[PDB]
């Protein structure tokens, strides 16, 4: 196999068509190719993430690996108050011999969507400059770090080796 699904995901789409019983070689090769296509989306997604100068993989980083790979667009993954990780993975289990998760969603009226006030908008961008170093040492203004709380904040694979002049 590989790590996508032996039958537990691909076969529940095979039954969604109507196809009753198919061999496990079909599901093995089919799920291998499906998660190869998933990795093929993921690699263009991390390329767009790197060239967008970011560290998370947002939903608009995989939605631009779709237009590049000509995939029909997955609409409906961007809503109001677009924050980083707008938490929406409330998927609800349903019992049986196996597990089924169905992503419950609450219906809403229209007149509480038109009579709803507008959010806050921040300021337009500005800049602010200071001295990071004057001769190779850091002048320890409020805008500089402390170089001892850099230990207790980040591990040395996302902050690198601390050496000073």
């Amino acid at each position: 196999y590989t790590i996508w699904s032996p039958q537990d995901t691909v076969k529940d789409v095979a039954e969604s068509l109507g196809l009753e019983n198919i061999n496990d070689d079909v599901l093995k090769a089919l799920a291998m190719d499906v998660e190869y296509r998933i990795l093929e989306i993921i690699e263009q997604a991390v390329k767009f993430k790197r060239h967008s100068k970011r560290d998370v993989l947002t939903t608009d980083d995989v939605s631009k690996a779709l237009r590049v790979l000509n995939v029909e667009p997955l609409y409906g993954y961007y809503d109001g108050s677009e924050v980083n990780k707008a938490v929406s993975f409330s998927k609800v289990n349903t019992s049986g011999g196996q597990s089924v998760y169905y992503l419950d969603e609450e219906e809403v009226d229209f007149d509480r969507l038109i009579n709803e006030p507008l959010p806050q908008v921040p300021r337009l961008p500005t800049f602010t400059t200071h001295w990071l170093a004057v001769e190779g040492v850091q002048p320890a203004i409020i805008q500089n770090p402390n170089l001892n709380d850099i230990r207790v904040s980040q591990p040395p694979f996302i902050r690198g080796a601390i050496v000073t002049a």
């Binding site: 602010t128 400059t129 200071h130 002048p139």
Partner: peptide, 21 residues
């Protein structure tokens, strides 16, 4: 001589614009 910081021609606003708003 060693412990002197130079001056910038323009630095941006970071606190005055808050009370200005």
């Amino acid at each position: 001589i060693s412990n002197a910081i130079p001056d910038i021609v323009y630095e941006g606003v970071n606190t005055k614009t808050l009370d200005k708003m």
